[model samples]
Target: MDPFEGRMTFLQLLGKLNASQFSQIKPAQFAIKHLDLEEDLYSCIWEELESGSFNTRVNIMYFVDTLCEMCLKNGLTGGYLNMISRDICKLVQNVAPIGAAGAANAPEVRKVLQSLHEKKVIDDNQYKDAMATVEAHEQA
Candidate 1:
C-alpha cells in the first residue's frame, strides 16, 4: 500500500512527501482534484510558497506544473484558476530560488530567473544551473 495515499491538500501532501513520492503524478492529481476544479490552486500555492522546507516547496511547485498540464489536456484555459506556470515560477523563485528545479520554467522563464539572480537568492553558478535545468525541461 502507498503510505502517502490520502485526501490531504496539495500543500499538505507536498509536506509529507519525499522527492521520489512527490514526483509521482497520482498524488499530484489527487491534490489537484482537492484543489477543486472551480478553485484557484494558486491561492493554496501561495501558502505553500510562504511555508514548508525547500523540498516541500519544490514538490508543491511540481504539483502545480502537473495541474497545469492536466488542465491543458482537458481543454482548460489560463488564468489564476487554470494555469500559471510563470507566476508559480516567480513565486517559487521568490520563496526559495536555490536548489529548486522545475519551479522556474516556461513563459518568460529567463526573466524571473534574472530576477532571482538580482535578488541574490541565487549566485552566478546557481543562475546558470537554474537556466540550464529549466531549458532542458522546456525542450522535453
Candidate 2:
C-alpha cells in the first residue's frame, strides 16, 4: 500500500486497540513496516493514547517500547525514539494523571519507561526526568 493508505489503515487498527488482547507485536510490526510514515504514525499513536481509556493508554505505553525496539532492530535510528523522548512526560501524564487511577497505572508507565531507557531508546536524562514525573504522579 501507499504511505497514505498504509497510515490510514494503521490508524484504524490503532483505534481499535484495547487493553485486552494488547500484544506489542501487531503495532510494532506495522510501525516498522511503514517506517516511511513514522511521524504520522507516531502522531496517530499519541492521539489514540490520549483518547483511549486508562487501560488502553497503558497498553499504548507498552506499544511504544515495542515500537522502539522494532525500530532499532530494523537499523532505524531516532524516529520513534526521538519523538518519544520529546513527549515522554506528556505521554506519562496522559497514561497516569494525578489520581487513584493514575497511581494504579503508574507502575506500568514506569516499567515501560525503564524498558525504553534500558534499550537505549531514550537517554538517561530523559529517563530520569520522566521517571521523576511518573513517581510524582504515582504519589499524588
Candidate 3:
C-alpha cells in the first residue's frame, strides 16, 4: 500500500477511536497492518497524540502499549519500541500536561509506562526518565 494511503487509513481509524475502545484487538491489528509503513503510521500517531483530546491522547497511549507488545511478541523489530522510547517524555507531557486534567491522567500514564517497562519494550533508563517526567508534570 502507498504510504499516503496507510497514513490516511491510520489517521481515519484514530479519528474513530474513543477511550472506551482502546483495549479492543482491532486497533492493534490495524496498526500492525501498516508495519511496513512505520514512519507514516508513527507520524500519524504523534500528530494525534499532540492534537487529540485528553481522552484520545490517553487512548493512544494505551494503543501504543498494545502495539509495542505485539511488535515484541511477534519479534518484528519494527522500531516501534525505539520510536516510542524516543517520544516517551513528549508523549507523556501531551497526554498528561500540567493542570487538573493532566493530573487526572497521571496515574494511567504511569501505569502504561510501567507496563511498557515490565514488558521489556523499554529499558530501565527509559522507564525511569519517563516516570521522572510524569512526576514533574504531576507536581505542576
Candidate 4:
C-alpha cells in the first residue's frame, strides 16, 4: 500500500498566528506542502509577487486566477487554491502582505471556468468544484 494513500491532507492554519508566530516556522517552508504544485509554478508566481524589490503589496489571489485558467484550458484538475486559501489569506494579511481585491491586481476569471464547462472541455462536477474554490479564494 502507498504510504500517502488514502490520507487526508489540509492547509497549514495560520489565521491565529502573528509576526511572532512567524519566527517559529522554518524558512523555505511554505504553508502549502500537500498541494500538487509545480516548483516552477510557485517560483513564477513568487517572482512576480515578490518583484519590484519594493514594499508593494502583492495581490496573492492573482495566482489562483492563473491556476484556474491553466487547468480549465488544458483540461486538468489543478486544485491547490482550495487547499491553501486559508494560509494565503493569513500570510497575505499578516505577512507577505497580499491582497485579493479590486480589478487591477486580482481580476475575476469566472468566464474561463464557464467557457470550459460550456465547451464540454471540463466536466460539470469538476468545473463546479473549480468555480466554488476560485470563488472562495476571491472572497477570502
Predicted model with the maximum lDDT = 3
What TM-score, over all chains together, does every model reach? 0.47, 0.88, 0.89, 0.29
**What global local distance difference test value does model 2 have?**
0.80
Give lDDT tens digits, candidate 1, residues 9-110: 444544555445346466556644544432434555566667766556555555554555564555555443223533544553543454434444343456
- Lowest lDDT sum, 10 consecutive residues, model 4, at 6-15
Show where candidate 3 strays beyond 4 Å: 20-24
Which regions of candidate 1 fall more than 4 Å away from where they truly are? 1-11, 21-40, 79-89, 95-140
Clashes of each: 0, 0, 0, 1
Better candidate number, 1 or 2, judged by lDDT: 2
> In model 3, how large is the Cα lDDT of residue 18?
60
- Candidate lDDT scores, in order, read 0.51, 0.80, 0.81, 0.37
Judged by TM-score, which candidate is best?
3
Which pairs clash (backbone N, Cα, C closer than 3 Å) in model 2?
none
Q: In model 2, where do residues sit more than 4 Å from their true spots?
A: 15-22
Model 3 Cα shift for residue 6 (angstroms): 0.8
